[PDB]
Amino acid sequence: ASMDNYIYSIAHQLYEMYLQDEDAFHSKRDYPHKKVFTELQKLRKIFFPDFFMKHQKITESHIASELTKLVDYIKDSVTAYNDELFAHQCVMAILEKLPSIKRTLKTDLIAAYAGDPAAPGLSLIIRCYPGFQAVIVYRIAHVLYECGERYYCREMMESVHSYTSIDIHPGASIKGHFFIDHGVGVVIGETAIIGEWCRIYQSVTLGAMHFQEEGGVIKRGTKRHPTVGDYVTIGTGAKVLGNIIVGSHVRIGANCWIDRDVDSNQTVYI
Amino acid sequence: ASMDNYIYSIAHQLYEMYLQDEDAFHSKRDYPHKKVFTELQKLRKIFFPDFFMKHQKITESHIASELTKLVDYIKDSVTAYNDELFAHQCVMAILEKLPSIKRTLKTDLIAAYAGDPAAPGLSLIIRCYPGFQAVIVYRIAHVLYECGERYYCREMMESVHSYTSIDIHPGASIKGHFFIDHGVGVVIGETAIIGEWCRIYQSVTLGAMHFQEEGGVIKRGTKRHPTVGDYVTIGTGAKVLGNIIVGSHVRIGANCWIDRDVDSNQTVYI
Amino acid sequence: ASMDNYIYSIAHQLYEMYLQDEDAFHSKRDYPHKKVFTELQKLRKIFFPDFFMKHQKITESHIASELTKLVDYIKDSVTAYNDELFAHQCVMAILEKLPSIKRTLKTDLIAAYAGDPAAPGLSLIIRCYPGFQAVIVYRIAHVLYECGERYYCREMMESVHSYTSIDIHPGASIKGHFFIDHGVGVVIGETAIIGEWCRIYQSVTLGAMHFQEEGGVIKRGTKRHPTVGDYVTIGTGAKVLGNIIVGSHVRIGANCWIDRDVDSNQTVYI
Known about the structure:
homotrimer, alpha/beta, serine acetyltransferase, domain 1, UDP N-Acetylglucosamine Acyltransferase, domain 1, five-stranded parallel β-sheet, globular, transferase (chains A, B, C), Hexapep (chains A, B, C), Ser_AcTrfase_N_sf (chains A, B, C), serine O-acetyltransferase activity (chains A, B, C)
């Protein structure tokens, strides 16, 4: 039970982080029960227990129990697509990263409240903002991708895709204070890199298109989606395509078609 | 049981309205059973019983029973986010408005059939048109918002968002004969105002974008989304942003980026 | 049990096709169990049993059993909206076409792998690519439409719409080697015709818009959506509207608004 002993240590760290979180990340309310797909259902309970438990139930031992449920689930799925040893390794990698992911998700909530005049408090963002639900699962799927996994991490993100219409490839690399508002139609590709304080609206693509060539069979992988710096806002409907760099402090306008580098500190519109 | 006595009176009024509805809003067919999220599942049965019951079951007493189920559900959720007294008030406000909402939803079905060459009859629109499912729940969520509620009404609309990819803030104000066709990617903001006979397509935003400012924390609320008059058609992909006024009898073209006032009786294209 | 005898013959043909499929369409892995809407759940098991059964269970008799479940389900739904005799006819039409649909879906998987650098193998596309899930159900819904059915086939595609945000009318006519990548926001209309090797991205419309006329009640049906030739790629956000013809070997750019004929062998951008 070496993985079980590692689960206990991580559940302990996450519980101490919960005890020390600011009041804005806490509540005494017992919120309505919901049932969403497994990965999100579990990660919700683990990161933000006040909002998805059951105040009477909120303890280190219950965090550990839900974490064990999640671990068994992901281990079984990664084993199914790969093998038992690779699945063990990858899940130990998820467990190791959960405290850092918790810290990042707090920054993501901060950016969501900060970027949205319609948000009354963090509790609503935690409970139901779809950009935030997507990001929760994304940050865990990305650890899988970083372990070299290529199948289950995509299936996990396809659950996010069905639930929110937000399409983030598990290989995308995204920094903190990240916010997708509204979110339907957002597509972020396998090799996308996104810096800190990125704000993205509905129908935004940070992606690529591939015009048919014969047909042959397109080259697999390679860096082919945009790299986006810090403090970038991408307006509703903007399509940013190809292996291009958008600099820091860039504002992109609605419906823009961007296929070349955009230098820092400027506003693009037509 | 004062609220129970009010439920009976409203269920009676809705039942008499059902008896008096035109043939187009009735059917003798027993349609396939479906299970969708609670608010829609219940509101479907209450407004359009022929299409979601169980012909043998269709009586005043069954309308009352489903209405009670819906009331208990929404009362519990509003209580969870707020308090018991506020929840009582808000739900009494929903109950009071249900007969008017029923009348409006009939106009919405009229506009859907009228605006869609692919619709064979109202029954299909009632049973499965996603724009119409969204509008059913929207009209009830908006009564909550009008009572001053800011949390559960958004969660209700996030259920609509997941189910249909149509994103309507419960604070939006929308008149009758309303139709969203196709609907994926539609975003309608908290302070949007939409007049009568509005026809909206997929990927339309009546919304706002907020370019990052430092960062600081954006001002909460205020009128900041468009106001749209009567007989307005907004084409696929159009992004209408900001506190701007679009007049009556306006046609907006595909992919348009609209950020200033548009006067009545004109067509916008590029 | 004439329909049951026809089911056996079709299940036999599909089983022999499964035995003869290339290695790429097979797996020995027992993949994680999922539960999606009935039509997709069943069609998945029938066409690609290795990926959705239960290796121990994969036999002619189990293909037959799932096929019977699917047939009873669709027969009941078509009967509900129409009548028992019409439902029998239409379902016998589905059964007759299943071997050809299987062959076509193999070409669709080929085009998906070929057109997507992020796809590691056909198994992932079969298991979770949303464009492919949509196409599975579309090819069956279209047989219903071809039988003259106008209600349940749309409800089936509305399930696809909720699950994937891809909106394909069952009347659309689409050839093989078809691929929708990402797919959120794709709309393909009742009278659309799409040739071989079509590649379509997120937020693409092959559709129509109808500006309000008075209001009157718009003419029902008629050819009113585009006809697209072979080897056509339609970029993210492109809106192709009206009864127009796009030729073969055409590449359409991001966010394009297309409302007139486009001749073969050219690239459209602005």
